[PDB]
């Protein structure tokens, strides 16, 4: 039950950490590598963002995850 102000900020923050910490780089490696082995027309996209969603959550440094779970709590409970 969020102040939609905070939502905008949480979204801006996640992006800033994920750039810094190399998460951005590694996800683009993964996609480029998957597509290179698949074929582009060959792929069935979302047969694709679905496949890697497990891997991407688990690539998140536990330090990043903790700061995020910090603010998400300080919001969901006011």
């Amino acid at each position: 039950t969020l102040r939609s102000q905070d939502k905008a900020a949480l979204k801006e923050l996640l992006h800033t950490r994920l750039v810094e910490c190399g998460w951005h780089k590694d996800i683009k490696e993964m996609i480029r590598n998957i597509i290179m082995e698949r074929g582009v027309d060959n792929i069935n996209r979302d047969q694709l963002a679905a496949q890697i969603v497990p891997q991407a959550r688990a690539l998140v440094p536990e330090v990043v995850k903790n700061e995020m779970m910090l603010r998400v709590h300080a919001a969901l409970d006011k």
Binding site: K11, L14, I31
Partner: peptide, 24 residues
């Protein structure tokens, strides 16, 4: 109770960050 709900927020914002990349 909010526990499960905090996990839905984080997981939704994160799946939305993957698409972020994915579009460009």
């Amino acid at each position: 109770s909010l526990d499960e709900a905090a996990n839905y927020l984080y997981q939704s914002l994160l799946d939305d960050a993957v698409v972020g990349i994915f579009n460009e």
